[PDB]
């Protein structure tokens, strides 16, 4: 019973703590993701190939 | 003034071209990846190389007699054909022998011993082929007229006799090796069937193909002289070349490995 009640109460605190969590809207999260992508869309050698001058992999 | 080719010569040339193409394809597949550096695959590659040499020599000889007017260079071509045929027989014997030291030393295979064995055996096979190809370009030639020519226009009698003897001895060795392999296969098949006969059909097919492809030439060469009807040589040599169209498929295509690469 002690183990069962312990696990039950622990689940209780975990659930109540994770219930009262701010939920930011997806819209501005996607906006931030787009902003990061555009701000770092240029430093993407995997998407923008570069010549052998600065490509030691030859 | 050059001779007019006959139909049989055209048939021989086209068979040589087909053999050359098939063996070139097989060797290209084998050499395509460094991951096929295995003893059995190495021997298969050696067989393919020997057959490619045979086909290329045959086609070059045909093109150097009836199209490009000349005869002095054809002797080297016949020597190359002899070397290639001896190499092919030796390589087939090598493959058959290695097929038994892997079915009997199953607990010691994958070791430097196998590498040393295959290296030494391949070296001996190619040395013998080189010797037999060099012999017709040495003191024992019928061109000088101090010897008896045989059923082959530039060849002689002694060379054909020694070649036939060597081939017969190798045939005996191969017969014994299968016999042993058939014994082992029958034992395993019986053990499997204990807890309720395709293990011999392949051996019979392979042996019958090899016999029906090689034996007639030697058999009708031994009891013959340089006066037989011309068509006899072509009729007896056609199966010898045809053998190179059945060796590579059996020994490098029925395998489940190369088949996938071929499908690509």
């Amino acid at each position: 019973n002690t183990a069962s009640i312990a696990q039950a109460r622990k689940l209780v605190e975990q659930l109540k703590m994770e219930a009262n969590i701010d939920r930011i809207k997806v819209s501005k999260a996607a906006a931030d993701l787009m902003a990061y992508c555009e701000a770092h869309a240029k430093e993407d050698p995997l998407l923008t190939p570069v010549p052998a001058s600065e490509n030691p992999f030859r | 003034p050059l001779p007019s080719p006959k139909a049989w010569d055209v048939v021989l040339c086209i068979s040589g071209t087909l053999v050359s193409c098939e063996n070139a394809l097989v060797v290209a597949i084998i050499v395509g990846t460094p991951a096929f550096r295995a003893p059995m695959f190495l021997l298969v590659g050696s067989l393919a190389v020997a057959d490619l040499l045979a086909g290329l020599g045959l086609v070059l000889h045909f093109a150097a007699v009836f199209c490009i007017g000349s005869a002095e260079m054809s002797l080297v071509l016949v020597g190359v054909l002899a070397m290639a045929f001896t190499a092919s027989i030796g390589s087939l014997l090598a493959i058959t022998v290695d097929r038994y030291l892997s079915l009997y030393n199953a607990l010691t295979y994958y070791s430097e011993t196998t590498v040393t064995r295959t290296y030494v055996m391949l070296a001996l096979v190619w040395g013998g082929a080189l010797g037999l190809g060099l012999l017709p370009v040495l003191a024992w030639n019928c061109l000088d007229g101090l010897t008896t020519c045989g059923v082959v226009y530039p060849l002689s009698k002694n060379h054909l006799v020694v070649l036939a003897i060597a081939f017969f001895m190798v045939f005996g060795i191969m017969l014994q090796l299968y016999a042993q392999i058939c014994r082992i296969v029958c034992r395993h098949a019986q053990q499997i069937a204990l807890q309720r006969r395709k293990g011999i059909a392949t051996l019979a097919v392979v042996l019958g193909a090899f016999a029906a492809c090689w034996l007639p030439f030697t058999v009708y060469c031994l009891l013959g002289d340089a006066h037989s009807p011309p068509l006899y040589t072509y009729l007896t040599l056609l199966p010898a070349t045809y053998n190179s169209m059945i060796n590579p498929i059996i020994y490098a295509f029925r395998n489940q490995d190369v088949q996938k690469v071929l499908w690509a």
């Binding site: - | 079915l103 199953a106 607990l107 430097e112 098949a189 204990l194 395709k198």
Partner: protein, 214 residues
């Protein structure tokens, strides 16, 4: 100073080549013991390994819910599975474990070396078992090979407990791996020569099927 780096690389390469040459000499085996079926007597942190030898061909054996770490033994030569012959229906648990290990969906080139063990207890119990109704509807195999001093009931039980782990083994294997009963009892000393022969047999069968004869 790149010359020193290249020399070190070559030295490490040759050392690795020597280590690989040493490595590619021995075989590997796995022991899926039922838990108490004499895992200590058949030996003749968590991972425990043993290294015996037969005819100078050094082997390699090692012991271990189990739904995952089977992935680490995809190249073992064979599995030395050890059953207990005393049945309580724990024999059903052993049969279920064997069934799960059979249709693993990943281990399709592994053969099992069965070691039915503790026959003396079975003989004592049968002479002095019957839970499965299928036992009554059974007959001794026509090709029985009983050792001297055996009772018909004892032989019936012995060959019925071995007919449950093969009735499923040779059902779905596409001729890639087989089972090999080797009845033993706490009483034997040459089980080490029932492993060597079976390993040789498995490798020979694999080579034969590779050549496409049988």
């Amino acid at each position: 100073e790149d010359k020193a780096a290249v020399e070190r690389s070559k030295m490490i390469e040759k050392q690795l080549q020597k280590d690989k040459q040493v490595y590619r000499a021995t075989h590997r085996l796995l022991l899926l013991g039922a838990g108490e079926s004499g895992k200590s007597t058949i030996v003749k942190s968590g991972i425990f390994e043993t290294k015996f030898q037969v005819d100078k061909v050094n082997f390699h054996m090692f012991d271990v819910e189990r739904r995952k770490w089977i992935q680490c033994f995809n190249d073992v030569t064979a599995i030395i599975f050890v059953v207990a012959s005393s049945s309580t229906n724990r024999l059903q648990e052993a049969l279920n474990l064997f069934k799960s290990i059979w249709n693993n969906r990943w281990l399709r080139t592994i053969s099992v070396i069965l070691f039915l063990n503790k026959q003396d207890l079975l003989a004592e119990k049968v002479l002095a078992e019957d839970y499965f109704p299928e036992f009554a509807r059974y007959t001794t195999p026509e090709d029985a090979t009983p050792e001297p001093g055996e009772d018909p009931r004892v032989t019936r039980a012995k060959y019925f407990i071995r007919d449950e782990f093969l009735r499923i083994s040779t059902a779905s294997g596409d001729g890639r791996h087989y089972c090999y009963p080797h009845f033993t009892c706490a009483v034997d000393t040459e089980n080490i020569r029932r492993v060597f022969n079976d390993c040789r047999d498995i490798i020979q069968r694999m080579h034969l099927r590779q050549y496409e004869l049988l």
